[PDB]
Design a protein around this ligand. Structure first.
Ligand SMILES: OC[C@H]1O[C@H](OC[C@H]2O[C@@H](O)[C@H](O)[C@@H](O)[C@@H]2O)[C@H](O)[C@@H](O)[C@H]1O
Ligand SMILES: OC[C@H]1O[C@H](OC[C@H]2O[C@@H](O)[C@H](O)[C@@H](O)[C@@H]2O)[C@H](O)[C@@H](O)[C@H]1O
Ligand SMILES: OC[C@H]1O[C@H](OC[C@H]2O[C@@H](O)[C@H](O)[C@@H](O)[C@@H]2O)[C@H](O)[C@@H](O)[C@H]1O
Ligand SMILES: OC[C@H]1O[C@H](OC[C@H]2O[C@H](O)[C@H](O)[C@@H](O)[C@@H]2O)[C@H](O)[C@@H](O)[C@H]1O
Lengths: 18, 133, 16, 133, 16, 133, 16, 133
């Protein structure tokens, strides 16, 4: 992995990103 | 309805649910993954019958749910989950049921759904989802 | 505190 | 719009945002808690002005958000967040903005919102939330 | 719970 | 030896292990808790016999491990775990095996041990632990 | 990212 | 000694400590990562002076700690951390200090060190680490 901590991310709400 | 709580697992392998084009979501059962082995969750059945069954077999572990959306509405004086849609990184499953009422959606940028809990009487009354990395 | 592991839980959606 | 990503912290102390009763949400800024100390995040502003400011001061740490809801909809041909409401274990803040369009809501049964990210052009185009235990 | 985030903490090593 | 990986669960209810006062730790098996139900893990046995079995029955969920310690040493040309000791918030179990060699210890201020993995040949070659909140 | 949940793992202790 | 608690962050960019090869670890300070930006942690200084400074600059984010090990033991009547070593996926830093006494080591298969807490009087009395995914 990398040295960056990660967490759960919900969303996004609004304009579509995917 | 009769409450249920599946708990948290390692992932999701398959979802079996049933619906009715005139009412809402009926039965609900999940086949989870438990540390590499399939784990069949208990089958939460409706009090009545006449539903159309659906089987969603995910290509675990490369395919997984990225968004869960649906509608909650009134049926026979009860607020219940009338529809459900599952979007994975590969396909969209649904919508299943009736898309009338109040919408809701849960898109995930980072993390996974690892468990379900809720209540089912005649139809799916409500539900929550366990989230983890 | 408890010997029970825990997880983030979102919801419920539907009947109150 | 211009994208932003505050990242994750240990809690939330205060939220500052602006809206317009005829358009959508404009500016967005948060004062997070960082291991017991207030950490002032950057102010993410709209490319324009004329918004009504609002300050949400939480009685940290006894008071925390339990549910976030709002509305997304079309404005000038773009899809944006038009309204937001913050419900804590002690009070409800909002709604702020135009309660028109498609509703959404995120109730938290167990966990905490610890960060925000999104995009703002003339208005808030979209946003996500960091959740942790 | 409270409005404070948690993390796993291992230790301590050294004096009691 | 033969590698094993139990995976992650919800907690630990019971630990069954065997040792030899002259060599090291032999068999190793755990009864985990899976969302409120006991779940018996595979029994990981030594290639040989002659060990003394030990059952550590925890008063789940009020009693849980707070520190695991032991000694790793050389036995007949192989580096193995020669001894183990489990300390819970209620008492100390062990030491079991031979308290000789290089010591190691993992105290937990916040969190829980929810799984085990390792390898067992004639004796316990090595092991790791899964930690969670 | 795969569809497999992750958790912190410490170790191993013993042979290399 | 005087207790300290830095809390949890996003990662580690640089470690600055001082030691005395004939006694133990003295000063301790960490430059953390806070969502992509450097965050200078408070400097935890020894009650006395005369230590040798050491700077550990990590090639963040491609380089990170995989194992922390060391020794504890007495210096006069007090038990303290006599030595420390930091192994990353690229280099090994140390050992620094008296490599004698009671050994300890914490290898990490999956996860990251994201914070430190402990106590320092004349020397580093003891310490703990924050772990996360
Ligand atoms: O799933 C929704 C709802 O189902 C059950 O009750 C609905 C059922 O009640 C009867 O008394 C009425 O005659 C019939 O028309 C209704 O459909 C369940 O008992 C309830 O709690 C709720 O779950
Ligand atoms: O927030 C919605 C939207 O804002 C920008 O576009 C709106 C508007 O910006 C003005 O500066 C221009 O004069 C006008 O032509 C644009 O329509 C942003 O560019 C867009 O991506 C979106 O964020
Ligand atoms: O870090 C270890 C220790 O530091 C302080 O005590 C040091 C102590 O050493 C004695 O030999 C000296 O005569 C005396 O002046 C010093 O106080 C600290 O007080 C102690 O709690 C502990 O942290
Ligand atoms: O547990 C330590 C060690 O155990 C095994 O080695 C002991 C003997 O095992 C077999 O009988 C083999 O025939 C002999 O060569 C060997 O001495 C195991 O094979 C090792 O990998 C290790 O686990």
């Amino acid at each position: 992995q990398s040295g960056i901590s990660q967490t759960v991310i919900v969303g996004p709400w609004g304009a579509k990103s995917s | 309805g009769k409450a249920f709580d599946d708990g948290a697992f390692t992932g999701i392998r398959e979802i079996n649910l049933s619906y009715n084009k005139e009412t809402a979501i009926g039965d609900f059962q999940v086949v989870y993954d438990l540390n590499g082995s399939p784990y069949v969750g208990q089958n939460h059945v409706s009090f009545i019958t006449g539903f159309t069954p659906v089987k969603i077999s995910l290509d675990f572990p490369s395919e997984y749910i990225m968004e869960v959306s649906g509608y909650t509405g009134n049926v026979s004086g009860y607020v219940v989950v009338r529809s459900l849609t599952f979007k994975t990184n590969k396909k969209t499953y649904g919508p299943y049921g009736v898309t009338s009422g109040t919408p809701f959606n849960l898109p995930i940028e980072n993390g996974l759904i690892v468990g379900f809990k809720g209540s089912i009487g005649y139809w799916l009354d409500y539900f929550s989802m366990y989230l983890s990395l």
